[PDB]
Amino acid sequence: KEDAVPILPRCRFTGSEIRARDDALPVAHVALAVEGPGWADPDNVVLHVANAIIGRYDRTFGGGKHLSSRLAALAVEHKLCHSFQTFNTSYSDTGLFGFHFVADPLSIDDMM
């Protein structure tokens, strides 16, 4: 028992949402994700390559409207957000693949 590494009970993913609203906050944060493959899967490489294509942005990036990331260009062109990031958070048996952006109340829809 002492030198046996315990296997953890699996965690079930659920498509769903949770909305904590407070119009008193300056900007809004949104994060959306699908279920990931977990450390061991080779696919995680491709997934990361994918997030590489979408990339990330943030108002200080000087590249501006010329960034290669389409979402970043749009973000710039249409003042879509203050920032956004892709991510591929992995875990032993599962993970979270998605994105998170920060925007002003009235540009949330177009960004999403």
CA distance 76 to 71: 8
In this chain, which stretch among 41-49, 51-59, 80-88, 102-110 interacts with other proteins, using CB under 8 A? 102-110
In this chain, which stretch among 1-9, 17-25, 48-56, 73-81 interacts with other proteins, using CB under 8 A? 17-25
Q: Which residue has the tokens 């970043």?
A: 72
Segment (H or E) for 71: helix 70-77
One residue of 14, 62, 66, 68 binding other proteins per CB under 8 A = 14
Characterize the bridge pairing of strands 28-35 and 95-103.
antiparallel
In the complex, the residues that contact other proteins under the rule CB under 8 A are: 14-24, 105-106, 108-109
